[PDB]
């Protein structure tokens, strides 16, 4: 695991083509996320 | 130390997590080739996850972001996707849940889009597909995603394609 970047403590990967695709986040130490729920689902064959 | 408690779907928290889910769906520019072809999901159950330990741990280090940012966490929910959030909900996230080859680095990546993190549920670009008939579009085999509570704190903004 590699360390954040000086001074930060994550990184955003802000989309810059795809107009509709919303954000991405990198964090570089677990203990900066806990997972709070656990969803069980399938994708649903459009129509 | 983990326990599950399920939530009904009558339950305000098991609708706004669902709604979380449904609404954050996308179209991806594989067109489908990861996680396959699907506008929207059949939700199964929603289980909220417990462990004093784990929570512990995430809060004592969230107080040492926030001290360090003008007392501002910069707290999101997100989803993530992988292979092993059986062992997630069990020991917490650390350095073995790391996206080794990311475009931002080895560390641990999370997705406000629900249908990105559907993605990686199976392994990187969808590994082989489910395991049961090797199908990256399974329509039949149930497949789990966490939502998490992640501290961002100052966060990088890198700008990328
Ligand atoms: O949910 C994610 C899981 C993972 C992921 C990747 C590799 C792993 O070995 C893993 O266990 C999870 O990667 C993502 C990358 C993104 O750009 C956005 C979301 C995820
Ligand atoms: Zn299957």
Redesign the pocket.
Same mark, same amino acid.
């Given at each position: 695991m590699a360390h954040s970047p000086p001074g930060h403590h994550s990184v955003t990967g802000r989309p810059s083509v795809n107009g509709l695709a919303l954000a991405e986040y990198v964090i570089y130490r677990g203990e900066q996320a806990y997972p709070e729920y656990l969803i069980t689902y399938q994708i649903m064959r459009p129509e | 130390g983990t326990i599950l408690i399920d939530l009904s779907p009558d339950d305000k928290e098991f609708q706004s997590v669902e709604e979380e889910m449904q609404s954050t769906v996308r179209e991806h520019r594989d067109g489908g080739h990861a996680g396959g072809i699907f506008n929207r999901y059949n939700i199964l159950k929603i289980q909220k996850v417990c462990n004093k330990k784990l929570w512990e741990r995430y809060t004592h280090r969230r107080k040492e972001v926030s001290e360090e940012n003008h007392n501002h966490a910069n707290e999101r929910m997100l989803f993530h996707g992988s292979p092993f959030v059986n062992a997630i909900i069990h020991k917490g996230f650390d350095e073995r849940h790391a996206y080794i080859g990311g475009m931002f680095g080895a560390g641990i990546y999370f997705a406000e889009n629900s249908s990105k993190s559907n993605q990686y549920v199976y392994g990187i670009g969808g590994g082989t597909? %489910?395991?049961?008939?090797?199908?990256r579009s %399974?329509?039949? %085999?149930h497949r789990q995603l966490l939502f998490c509570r992640v501290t961002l704190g100052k966060s990088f903004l890198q700008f990328s394609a």
């Open positions: - | 597909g %489910c395991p049961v008939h090797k199908d %399974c329509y039949i %085999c």
